[PDB]
Amino acid sequence: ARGPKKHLKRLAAPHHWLLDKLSGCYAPRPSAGPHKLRESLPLIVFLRNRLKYALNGREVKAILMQRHVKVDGKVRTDTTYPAGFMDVITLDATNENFRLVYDVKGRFAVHRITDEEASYKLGKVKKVQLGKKGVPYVVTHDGRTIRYPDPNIKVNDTVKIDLASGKITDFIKFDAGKLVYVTGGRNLGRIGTIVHKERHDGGFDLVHIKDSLDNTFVTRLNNVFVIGEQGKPYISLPKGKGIKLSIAEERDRRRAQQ
C-alpha cells in the first residue's frame, strides 16, 4: 500500500523464530538481503533469543557495532541482517563459529562448528545463466553470483563456496542417491537420500527421499538442498541429523533420562 512495509507485527513473524507472544507488538523485520524474509534468521534473534548473549535489541546493536559478529566472513553490523540457511556466523570474541542449519523441528538450530569447516559454506544453484559479454555465472540460494562456473554445474546442484574468495571449490550433482537437506515444507529440517525425481513439466518437480531409518517422503524440488552423498555430508550435521522421530519415540527418548 503506497510502498514497501517496514514493520513486522508479532504473530506475523516466522514461527521458527520462537518469539515470545507477549513481549512487544513487533518482531524484527529482516532487512533486504541474501536469503529471504521468511527463510532467514535476523542477527538480533540469533544473538538475543538463540544464544542469550545480548539481553535486548540495544545490547544486540552494541554487540554488532563493535565488529564482533561476522556473517559469511564479513562484519555485518546490521541488526536485522537476514542470515539464512547454511550461513556461517563467527564471533571472534567467545571465539566460535556457527552454521545456520535447520534442526529436526524446522527451527534454525545453534550449530557450533570449527574454523576448518567454517572456512567455507554450501550453496544450492538457483540458476545457471550467461552474463554480459558471454560470461557464464551461477546464482546460488543465498543470492550469490559466481562467474565462470564449472560447465558441468546445473540447477539444483550444490557448490562449495570458498567464502574467502567466493569461488567454486567443489560441486555436488543433484542425482538419485545423494544426500539432501529439506529446506521447506512439512519435512523442513529432514536429511535423507534421493530415491526418485518426478518431472511434471510445467508443474512442480517432486523428489522422493529416504532417510537413514528408511522413512520415505516426497517433497517439492524447491526445498531439497543437496549436501553430499550417503554418510558423507559436506557439512557438519546438527545433533539430530534429520531423523524425524515420531512423538512416541521422542517421549521415549526424553524419559530414557530418569
Partner 1 sequence: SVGFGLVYNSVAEAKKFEPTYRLVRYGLAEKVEKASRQQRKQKKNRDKKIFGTGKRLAKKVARRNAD
Partner 2 sequence: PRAPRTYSKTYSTPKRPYESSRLDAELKLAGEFGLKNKKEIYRISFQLSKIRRAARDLLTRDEKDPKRLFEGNALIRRLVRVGVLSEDKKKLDYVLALKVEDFLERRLQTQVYKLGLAKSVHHARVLITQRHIAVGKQIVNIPSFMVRLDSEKHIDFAPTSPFGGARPGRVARRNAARKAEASGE
Partner RNA sequence: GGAUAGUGGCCUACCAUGGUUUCAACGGGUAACGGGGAAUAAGGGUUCGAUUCCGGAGAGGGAGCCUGAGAAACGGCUACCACAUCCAAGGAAGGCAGCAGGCGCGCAAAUUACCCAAUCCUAAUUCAGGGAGGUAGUGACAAUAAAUAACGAUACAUGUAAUUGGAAUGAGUACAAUGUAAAUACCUUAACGAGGAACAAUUGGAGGGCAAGUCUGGUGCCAGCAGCCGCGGUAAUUCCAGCUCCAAUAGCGUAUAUUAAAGUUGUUGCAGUUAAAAAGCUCGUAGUUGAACUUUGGGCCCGGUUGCAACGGGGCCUUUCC
Site residues (vs partner 1, CB under 8 A): 58-59, 62
Interstrand relation of 112-113 and 145-147 (parallel, antiparallel or unpaired): unpaired
CA dihedral 74, 79, 82, 85 (to 10 degrees): 70
Residue range at the interface with partner 2 (CB under 8 A); choices 37-45, 82-90, 188-196, 242-250: 242-250
- Quote the longest CA-to-CA distance of the chain: 66
CB of 188 to RNA, least distance (A): 20
CB of 258 to partner 2, least distance (A): 13
Please tell me the count of residues contacting partner 2 according to CB under 8 A: 10
Asked if 213 touches partner 2 (CB under 8 A), the answer is no
Which residues sit opposite 130 in a β-bridge?
A: 136
Which residue, 59 or 205, has its beta carbon nearer to partner 1?
59
Asked if 26 touches RNA (CB under 7 A), the answer is yes
88, with CB counted inside 10 A (0-12, 13-18, 19+), is buried
Q: Which three cell numbers stand for residue 152?
A: 558441468
Residue 245 touches which of partner 1, partner 2, RNA, none (Cβ within 5-8 Å per kind): none
Residue 127 touches which of RNA, partner 2, partner 1, none (Cβ within 5-8 Å per kind): none
Report d(CA 64, CA 67) in Å as an integer.
Answer: 5
Report d(CA 256, CA 258) in Å as an integer.
Answer: 6
CB of 32 to RNA, least distance (A): 9
Please tell me the count of residues contacting RNA according to CB under 7 A: 33
Asked if 257 touches partner 2 (CB under 8 A), the answer is no
Contacting RNA (CB under 7 A), which of 36, 53, 61, 68? 61
Q: Which three cell numbers stand for residue 77?
A: 553490523
Residue 69 touches which of RNA, partner 1, partner 2, none (Cβ within 5-8 Å per kind): none
Which residue, 61 or 154, has its beta carbon nearer to RNA?
61
In the shown chain, the binding pattern of residues 4 to 23 toward partner 2, with x for contact by CB under 8 A and - for none, equals: ------xx---------xx-
Which residue, 80 or 219, has its beta carbon nearer to RNA?
80
95, with CB counted inside 10 A (0-12, 13-18, 19+), is exposed
Residue 27, CA distances (Å) to 17, 78, 89, 132 in order:
10, 15, 21, 40
CA dihedral 87, 58, 20, 142 (to 10 degrees): -20
Which residue, 46 or 98, has its beta carbon nearer to RNA?
46
Question: In this structure, are residues 248 and 219 in contact, taking their beta carbons and an 8 Å threshold?
Answer: no
Contact set with partner 2 (CB under 8 A) = 10-11, 21-22, 24-25, 246-248, 251
